[PDB]
Structures are given as structure tokens and as C-alpha cells.
């Protein structure tokens, strides 16, 4: 889950 949630927000840093 944790890596997937991080990935959802990947394009916004």
C-alpha cells in the first residue's frame, strides 16, 4: 500500500 500511495503523488513534488 505505502509504495502505491507514494506513487499516486509522484508527479507532484
Amino acid at each position, epitope marked *: *500500500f*505505502k509504495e502505491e500511495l507514494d506513487k499516486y503523488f509522484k508527479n507532484h*513534488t
Partner: antibody, heavy 115, light 111 residues
């Protein structure tokens, strides 16, 4: 030592807006995901949305899309939630919670919407 | 928002007895992303279980979770006085982020 301290109770007229705050205390050395969850009288909790540790990204529950805004101030370890166009049904206790699984919780802020 | 049911609505049991709480999703729970929370009056919810079966840090061993597909269970092996409370399951997901609390089961003291 992950703890959250929320702002005090609010009373608002219908149609107004409210801005709640949630400040981390104790171990404030890293940044975490923060969620907002509300609970109307006699009801179960309802998830409103999430802001990522940097504050660069948010995602709101569809029921609140267009009505809620979350922001955070890394300098003060504070997260904000603003809810606009308040309705009678928005009377509830509003919680913030931290980490991936809402692992720790603030104490709640009562918001009453009434004339 | 996911669609969840919890049975029974109220569970009436005595201290020391085993409690079995059920949560059912309308469709198969993707990746077993199912959590359980405890809530007492005047307090915030408290995380018990995440990922269907992982116990959160500091939660007693008497709390355990199991399940897959549409059917998930929270078992309290022996009820202690502090365990009588409302219990919510919750389905969560990553794309898009979504957390949906179930309707809740109240565990009350039978007398």
C-alpha cells in the same frame, strides 16, 4: 511520541466557511501523511481527504470535492483544512489523523453550523 | 467510497468471551486493504488492524484479523472490560486514495 493537537471549537452560520488547524507535537522530526475525518452526532466516522507529507499533493473524498481545501505549513508542523459553504449537515466533530493507516489522532474539533 | 456492511449491528457478550465481528464488501476487496478501528464515547477512533491481518503497534495480542475476497473478520479472543466499544472496519485504496469506514458494530455487555 507522534501526537496531534487541534484548534478549538467553532460556531459558523450556514453558508460561511471554517478553517481548522492540526499541529504536530512530540516527535516532530519527520513529516507524515495527514487525514481529516469527521463524525456527525450519532454517526460513524467519515473520511474527508489526505495531504501528503510535503504538502505538494492532496486527494479529497468525492463528496467533499470542491468544498474542502487542505494545506500545510512545514515550518510550524501545522496542517489546515478549510470547508466552505457550510450546511447544517456539516455540524460534526472534525479529527485529523496521521500516517498511512490513521495510526494516531488529534483530539477533535467541534464545529457547529447554525443561525 | 467503498460499500461495506458489518454484522451483527450489536454483539452482546460477557467479559471473557470470544467476540467475532464480520465485515463484508459489495465487491472483492482489492489487495486485502481492510482495516479495523475501535471507538469509545468521547474519544477518537483507534487503529487495531491494517492490511486485513497486521496488528498495529501497541495493540494487545487478543485482537486478530483474517479475511480475503469479500469477507473479513476481527476476533477478540477474550473480551476485557476495556474492549466494549464500537468497532469499524474500513476499506482503503491507493489510486485514487480512498478510505471508507464501515457502518460499525457495537459490542455491549450482556447481563
Amino acid at each position: 511520541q507522534l501526537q496531534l493537537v487541534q484548534s478549538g471549537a467553532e460556531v459558523k452560520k450556514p453558508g460561511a466557511s471554517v478553517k481548522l488547524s492540526c499541529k504536530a507535537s512530540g516527535n516532530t522530526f519527520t513529516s507524515h501523511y495527514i487525514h481529516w475525518v469527521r463524525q456527525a452526532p450519532g454517526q460513524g466516522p467519515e473520511w474527508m481527504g489526505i495531504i501528503n507529507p510535503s504538502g505538494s499533493g492532496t486527494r479529497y473524498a468525492q463528496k467533499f470535492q470542491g468544498r474542502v481545501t487542505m494545506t500545510r505549513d512545514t515550518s510550524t508542523s501545522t496542517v489546515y483544512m478549510e470547508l466552505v459553504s457550510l450546511r447544517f449537515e456539516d455540524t460534526a466533530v472534525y479529527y485529523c489523523a496521521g500516517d498511512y493507516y490513521l495510526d494516531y489522532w488529534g483530539q477533535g474539533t467541534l464545529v457547529t453550523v447554525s443561525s | 467510497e467503498f460499500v461495506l456492511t458489518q454484522s451483527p449491528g450489536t454483539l452482546s457478550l460477557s467479559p471473557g468471551e470470544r467476540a467475532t465481528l464480520s465485515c463484508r464488501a459489495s465487491q472483492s476487496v482489492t489487495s486485502n486493504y481492510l482495516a479495523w478501528y475501535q471507538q469509545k464515547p468521547g474519544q477518537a477512533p483507534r487503529l487495531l488492524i491494517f492490511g486485513a491481518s497486521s496488528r498495529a503497534t501497541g495493540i494487545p495480542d487478543r485482537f486478530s484479523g483474517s479475511g480475503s475476497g469479500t469477507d473479513f473478520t476481527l476476533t477478540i479472543s477474550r473480551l476485557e472490560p476495556e474492549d466494549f466499544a464500537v468497532y469499524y472496519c474500513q476499506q482503503y485504496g491507493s489510486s485514487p486514495p480512498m478510505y471508507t469506514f464501515g457502518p460499525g458494530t457495537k459490542v455491549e455487555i450482556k447481563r
